[PDB]
Structure formats: structure tokens, C-alpha cells
């Protein structure tokens, strides 16, 4: 049993809710929020802007750090840092962006990452600005993810379709 609330059952291990993941993740704290992140973890705008914004950009400071000392992730990638006011840990994870010619086969790959962590909230990757289709994105989750994914659509519209789409 878990504290996720009001989210519809798409498969044994994923659930979807018309939420704000901001909001989402102040009020359950979860063990660990993910982060539509790009390689430089240049939280600007989508969700990054905005988990990174609800840090008062202490999300912002850890990154730069965290890159002067590593580098850029890979398109495909990820990494554990502290989720803040928002969840024990944010796992940052790197979908392919349409609108840089990323190849969209790197989706899987992204969403690969989730398995390390048994629970998870977090956003369709590389769905809003980064401009891949949001139901293919819900698709490759359900295929790809088998641990416990609670997953955040901000848009009511869009997840209404993603809800009735859904096979
Ligand atoms: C149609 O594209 C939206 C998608 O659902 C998407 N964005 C989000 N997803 C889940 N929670 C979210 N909180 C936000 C707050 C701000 Br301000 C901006 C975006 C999001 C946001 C890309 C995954
Ligand atoms: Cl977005």
C-alpha cells in the first residue's frame, strides 16, 4: 500500500492521474520524482522549469555542480539527485527531444532507467516540449517500465485521450 491517490489503473504496474506533478510531489513526497531532463540539466521551461522553480532553483545549483564535476548525461540517461522539498531523491532522466532530431528510439532507453527505482512519479518523457507523440510515450512506459510508475499529465485534455486511447 502506498499514498498515490486517485490515479486509474492502466496495467499491474502503471497508474495515470490529471495532475500537476509539482503539486503532486508536495503533497505525497514520494521516494523518488523524475525529472524531464536534457543533458546539460538546464532545468529551463516543462517540467524541469517547473520542479526546479518549486526548488527556489536549489535543483538548478546541485545540477551545475553536479555537471562541472561529470559532465553531460547521454540522451538516453540518467541520474539520482536530491529531490529537494519534493522527494527523497529526483531521478533525472533524459528522453530524446524531437525538436533537437533525437532519435526516438531512445525513448525505451529513457524509460529503462525507471526499473532501477520500485516506485516512481513522474511525467511521460519526452512528451510537452519535447515533442514526441504522448501516447507512443505511454506506450513505450507500459512496455518497458515493470516497477510501479505513477504518472503525472498536467494537460486534462491530453489525458483524457491517453485514457480513452489506451489498449
Ligand atoms: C502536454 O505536455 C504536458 C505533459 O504532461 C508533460 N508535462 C508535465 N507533466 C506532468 N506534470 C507537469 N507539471 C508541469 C508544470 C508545468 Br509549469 C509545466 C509542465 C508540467 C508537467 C511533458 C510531460
Ligand atoms: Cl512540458
Given at each position: 500500500v502506498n499514498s498515490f491517490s486517485g490515479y486509474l489503473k492502466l496495467?499491474?504496474?502503471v497508474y495515470i492521474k490529471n495532475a500537476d506533478i509539482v503539486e503532486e510531489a508536495k503533497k505525497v513526497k514520494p521516494t523518488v520524482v523524475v525529472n524531464a531532463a536534457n543533458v546539460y540539466l538546464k532545468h529551463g521551461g516543462g517540467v524541469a522549469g517547473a520542479l526546479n522553480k518549486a526548488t527556489n532553483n536549489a535543483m538548478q545549483v546541485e545540477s551545475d555542480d553536479?555537471?562541472?564535476?561529470?559532465?553531460?548525461?547521454?540522451?538516453?540517461?540518467?541520474?539520482?539527485?536530491?529531490?529537494?522539498?519534493?522527494?527523497?531523491?529526483?531521478?533525472?532522466?533524459?528522453?530524446?527531444?524531437?525538436?533537437?532530431?533525437?532519435?526516438?528510439?531512445?525513448?525505451?532507453?529513457?524509460?529503462?532507467?525507471?526499473?532501477?527505482?520500485?516506485?516512481?512519479?513522474?511525467?511521460?518523457?519526452?512528451?510537452?516540449?519535447?515533442?514526441?507523440?504522448?501516447?507512443?510515450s505511454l506506450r513505450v512506459c507500459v512496455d518497458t517500465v515493470r516497477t510501479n510508475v505513477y504518472l503525472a499529465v498536467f494537460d486534462k485534455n491530453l489525458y483524457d485521450k491517453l485514457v480513452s486511447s489506451f489498449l
Amino acid at each position: 500500500v502506498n499514498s498515490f491517490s486517485g490515479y486509474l489503473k492502466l496495467t499491474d504496474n502503471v497508474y495515470i492521474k490529471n495532475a500537476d506533478i509539482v503539486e503532486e510531489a508536495k503533497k505525497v513526497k514520494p521516494t523518488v520524482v523524475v525529472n524531464a531532463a536534457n543533458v546539460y540539466l538546464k532545468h529551463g521551461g516543462g517540467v524541469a522549469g517547473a520542479l526546479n522553480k518549486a526548488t527556489n532553483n536549489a535543483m538548478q545549483v546541485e545540477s551545475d555542480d553536479y555537471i562541472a564535476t561529470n559532465g553531460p548525461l547521454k540522451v538516453g540517461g540518467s541520474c539520482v539527485l536530491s529531490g529537494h522539498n519534493l522527494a527523497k531523491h529526483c531521478l533525472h532522466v533524459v528522453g530524446p527531444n524531437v525538436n533537437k532530431g533525437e532519435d526516438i528510439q531512445l525513448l525505451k532507453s529513457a524509460y529503462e532507467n525507471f526499473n532501477q527505482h520500485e516506485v516512481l512519479l513522474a511525467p511521460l518523457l519526452s512528451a510537452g516540449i519535447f515533442g514526441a507523440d504522448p501516447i507512443h510515450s505511454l506506450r513505450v512506459c507500459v512496455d518497458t517500465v515493470r516497477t510501479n510508475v505513477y504518472l503525472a499529465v498536467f494537460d486534462k485534455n491530453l489525458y483524457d485521450k491517453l485514457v480513452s486511447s489506451f489498449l
